[PDB]
Amino acid sequence: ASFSAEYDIVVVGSGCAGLTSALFSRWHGNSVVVLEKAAALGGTTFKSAFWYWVPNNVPMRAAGIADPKPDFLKYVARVTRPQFYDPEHPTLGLTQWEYDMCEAIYDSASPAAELLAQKGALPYRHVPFATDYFSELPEDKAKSGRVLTPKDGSPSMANGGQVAIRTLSTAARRDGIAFKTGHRVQRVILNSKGEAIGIEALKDDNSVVRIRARKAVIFGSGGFTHDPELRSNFLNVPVYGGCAAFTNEGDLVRITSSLGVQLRNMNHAWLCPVTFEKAIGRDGSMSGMFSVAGDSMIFVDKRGKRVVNEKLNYNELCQKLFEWDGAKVEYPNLVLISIWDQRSQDHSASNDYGSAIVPPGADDRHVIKSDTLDGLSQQISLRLKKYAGQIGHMELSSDFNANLRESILRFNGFASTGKDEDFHRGERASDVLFNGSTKKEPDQKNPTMWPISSVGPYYAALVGGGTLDTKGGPKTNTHGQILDIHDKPIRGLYGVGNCVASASSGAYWAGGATLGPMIAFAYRAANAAHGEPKRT
Amino acid sequence: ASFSAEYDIVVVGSGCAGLTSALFSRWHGNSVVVLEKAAALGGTTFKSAFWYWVPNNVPMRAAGIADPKPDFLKYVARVTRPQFYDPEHPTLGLTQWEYDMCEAIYDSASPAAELLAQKGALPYRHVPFATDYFSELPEDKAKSGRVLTPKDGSPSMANGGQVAIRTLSTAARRDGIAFKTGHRVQRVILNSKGEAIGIEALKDDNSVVRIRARKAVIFGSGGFTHDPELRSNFLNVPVYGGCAAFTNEGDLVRITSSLGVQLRNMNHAWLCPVTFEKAIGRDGSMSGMFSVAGDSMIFVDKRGKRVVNEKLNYNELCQKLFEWDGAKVEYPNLVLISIWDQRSQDHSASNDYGSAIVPPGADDRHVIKSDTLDGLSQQISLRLKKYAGQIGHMELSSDFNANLRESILRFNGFASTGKDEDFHRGERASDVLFNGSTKKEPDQKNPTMWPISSVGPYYAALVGGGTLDTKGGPKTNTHGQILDIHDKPIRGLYGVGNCVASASSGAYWAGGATLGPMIAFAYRAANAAHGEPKRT
Ligand SMILES: Cc1cc2nc3c(=O)[nH]c(=O)nc-3n(C[C@H](O)[C@H](O)[C@H](O)COP(=O)(O)OP(=O)(O)OC[C@H]3O[C@@H](n4cnc5c(N)ncnc54)[C@H](O)[C@@H]3O)c2cc1C
Ligand SMILES: Cc1cc2nc3c(=O)[nH]c(=O)nc-3n(C[C@H](O)[C@H](O)[C@H](O)COP(=O)(O)OP(=O)(O)OC[C@H]3O[C@@H](n4cnc5c(N)ncnc54)[C@H](O)[C@@H]3O)c2cc1C
């Protein structure tokens, strides 16, 4: 029973979690390999803007923006476990584990960011204007300032992930880390003491390779969005997919099923609305709809009524789509219809951040069009019929047309006063902050709303619920060590990123709140793995 | 090193799943032991009404009533997977597994029920008037008739579970099945071929015993409602507890963590509202609130407004309590307040079916009382403050009193016309079916509503979200065999009832839809287990 290759540390996956874990490991003097399931490096990280939320970061301190630790913990506790949050409780109402993980994020994200930049692997610039998603909470004492992004990201920052994967992987090759693509890890090999001593991977040609790890196996294999069975059986909502890399199929869940782990936070994903047709069609370029485009634009349900603030934070807005009507045995908002006019088409269109409104040249198969409102509803009906088998054979109400006219009349009044009496669109900072581009109007009272045109053409797109990726898996301690059911480390076995349980439950603290913590844990995991004895 | 006892079949748990599995096994000629963690037999089953939903049962056929199998499958497919339900799809939109499991229920529930009755273990009577929970759906072609209950159950049927446990356990002892209480199974023992050959159990004195199973170990160990870590980490909603027996702590989840199983349907429980204070205080006698008592009674939120049909099916009503307000980072309906008057107190009180309205002599610590509405709100506020750390420090709104008066006036008008224009209380058959007792009023237009008295005293109780129990665990095939990750049986290992994955997802088809299927699977499991070779 022997191995065709041997390294000190074997890393699984080449997104943020894998690359950073590998670099930190290598810089301690270990030999390292990165095993990537796909043909290309980068996973979901590659598609991201690579905002990374780093509490008490060096640029903030240089700018004179304070980030006190007790207040950091209160902010995250209040957002993460609202029912239990208590400022007088010794762990703010969090479990000891959740509290310890949040503390580790605060302690380790900045040194991790600093080392990656110092070595030239992830040079950054500060994004001082990027504001926390629940900045209005009094617990938040550093409402803006925590976000970094790759130094050479574009001005929109939309290509940040591509830049990060380039800088990280360039530094990895420079520093002698080995890479194997088309290697799907499928097993952890144990010694007789039950310690991880290597992996088995399936190659594209269907050969199996065994690779030894002298000190540690570190998983950075991403989530399970694109295993439909796992997704449907674990998540708290029945999402249609998400912007995760399609190779993120929850392999670690199968890999650990015989290792005695504790699967934790399996009920939660990072959530976001998606352009429904791109989810169903498996458009690999799809982004979550982080900014819902248009000011002269509303969402309506199948009755032709507004049901939600369209500018609400994406992780929260997605949840509205899965409200349950128990009397009718249906999801009334399963798909919502975004409706906009020529003004929003011309001035709110974007290639970035999952906008449904796209400029000339962009893929617009998901866009529904008509010269009149009555014509639009007939076009929407055809689209619903096309996807009937995915959406409970949903149909527009027989009163749709008249309801939509009433909805627009009401909205147009709100747009003129600047006050949305129904859903408070534009009243929270995050509504304005992620509003997207608009035609700036001299006398606009609220930047998130402008009256919808009294003439066509009119445009629409179906909006459904998806993920960025999942955030449940084997529980680790704060050093990235995968625990057995008695809360003790399985020696040699580590996990970082979306493949292990996040301490953020169902919450999404700020932009960059996936990547920032992840880099902290890669640093802590690599530092602990470096201290393993060489084994078997 | 060895075993202190040996049987052909070892059954774990003494609720419906375990007792029926054991009886079926014994009647095939195997020696059988039943191992119970608690001091007494019966688990959650003991507390139930023991309705059991049996498609195509003998009473229905005697009435000349068809229960056509394709239509049975369409009903359960429509309720279980609403998004994907399609009458033209080869498995109605279900996965092959879901479809096969639902078919097995139809095929095996009636023969299982007939044999239990034939042997004198579970004599039954028909419950002809119990209509399915979604009987109005056109897919349901046998809208009433499927429910059986223990022949000697009381007229209310509330003691059906006690009767069933008595008849089942009496037959088990009569037929030579062995029983051991205070035996907490904690491990499955495997041979070198990886087959289950017995168990290890922890006894009360903290000794461990090994018991050999020549043919099979059959788990019927119930769900994980009362492991708060598992509950919070897996279920789709953050429930506070449930009427499951307190010994249902998800031991099988830990037992199988190194066995390579597929945990499935972990995101779903059988849901129901509960008397919140009884959940928090772990009242072991608590029932889920299947019947929300009172016609002169409303539920209000912390703003003093109605938000839901109070008579809606319990599994669906519970979901209303967990709607999420992303703008305020809170659950607006986390607890609702049931408010009633003297008429409902006197004529709707019940010790059964989880009623918050309780008769004289009953434990009434959960009941809030005051001589004016303004006084009632002051008493409710004190109760919210008592449980603040569990409910996000919820407070009544500053306009609560005025809103409550407006809510009562509006409801009173609905009660007089018989038409609840807001939430349609009483319009579905199931609202009437679980309406509970009421004072007969000559000219009452809708049995579920009567105007609330303009004089006190007034009464209230906090209502929160809970379970009957969970319905996620190791996936089995239709023969109750626990599968490995490659969908192949782990030889000798079986599971029946709440301890394994239900094929009903998040749905609750009808009264008796937990016990009816469970008896079908106990029969199929026992039949397959009987065919195992004797091993090790
Ligand atoms: C469009 C978009 C924008 C986003 N923007 C941001 C943002 O700006 N900030 C932020 O914090 N978050 C953002 N997110 C979320 C963020 O991208 C992810 O949470 C993060 O990139 C996940 O990193 P990871 O290393 O865990 O996984 P990934 O980057 O998904 O990498 C996992 C890798 O493991 C590989 N793998 C899987 N199985 C195996 C196996 N068996 N063997 C070997 N390799 C395997 C996969 O192929 C993949 O390459 C965004 C998400 C999307 C979709
Ligand atoms: C008040 C109430 C009323 C209900 N009414 C109905 C109804 O009318 N019809 C219906 O269909 N459903 C009803 N339900 C739901 C139904 O009672 C359950 O779904 C069903 O009884 C579960 O049966 P079971 O055998 O899987 O588990 P249980 O009856 O819970 O039995 C499991 C047993 O396993 C034991 N156990 C646990 N761990 C171990 C271990 N490690 N070793 C050994 N033993 C162990 C437990 O102590 C317990 O005795 C009701 C539920 C409640 C709470």
Residue numbers in the entry:
A (entry chain AAA), B (entry chain BBB): 63 to 598
Passage from the reporting paper:
Additionally, the final product is often contaminated with side products due to over oxidation and therefore requires considerable purification efforts. This manuscript focuses on a cyclohexanone dehydrogenase (CDH), EC number 1.3.99.14, an enzyme which can perform α,β-desaturation of carbonyl compounds with exquisite selectivity. CDHs belongs to the succinate dehydrogenase/fumarate reductase flavoprotein superfamily and use flavin adenine dinucleotide (FAD) as a cofactor to perform the dehydrogenation of cyclic ketones. The natural substrate for CDHs is cyclohexanone, a simple cyclic ketone. The SelenoMet WT CDH crystal structure was solved using single wavelength anomalous diffraction (SAD), using the selenium atom as the dispersion centre. The crystal structure of WT CDH is organised into two domains: a catalytic domain (Cd) which is situated at the ‘top’ of the enzyme when viewed in the orientation shown in Fig. 3A and an FAD binding domain (Fd) which is situated at the ‘bottom’.
The Cd arises as an outcropping of the Fd α9–β11 loop and superficially resembles a Rossmann fold consisting of an α–β–α sandwich but consisting of just four β strands rather than the canonical six. The Fd domain is a classic example of a Rossmann fold. The FAD cofactor was found to occupy a deep positively charged channel through the interior of the Fd in agreement with other published structures. This pocket has three solvent-accessible channels: only one of these channels (labelled ‘1’ in Fig. 4A; this channel will subsequently be referred to as the entrance) is situated adjacent to the isoalloxazine moiety and is wide enough to allow passage of the substrate. Channel 2 (subsequently referred to as the exit) is also adjacent to the isoalloxazine but partially occluded by it, meaning it is too narrow to allow passage of the substrate. Time course analyses using the DCPIP assay gave greater detail about the differences in substrate specificity. WT CDH showed highest activity against cyclohexanone, closely followed by 3-methyl-cyclohexanone, weak activity against 4,4-dimethyl cyclohexanone and no activity against δ-valerolactone and dihydrocoumarin.
